[PDB]
Amino acid sequence: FASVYAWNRKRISNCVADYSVLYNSASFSTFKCYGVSPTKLNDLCFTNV
Amino acid sequence: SSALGKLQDVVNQNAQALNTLVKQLSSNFGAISSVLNDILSRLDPP
Secondary structure (H helix, E strand, C coil): CCCEEEEEEEECCCCCCCHHHHCCCCCCCCCCCCCCCCHHHHCCCCCCC | CCHHHHHHHHHHHEEEHHHHHHHHHHHHCCCCCHHHHHHHHHHCCC
């Protein structure tokens, strides 16, 4: 991974994102969503992640 | 043929008010957007 004082920054772009494989992976100890509740991610489109 | 300002003013006032009414459908009043399909199409029922 990358340090905390120089974090990384990847600019995901035009693609097919499946936040369900993330949301249900049960391997994550913390999964908070703020602007938008998690289950509605696989039904929206943005400009850049 | 070459003065009806009192009749023109009541038309203008009513139109200026009806436009201000519709132009308010695009203010947040302290919310994340002005569209219900953006608070709903991206937010839980709570």
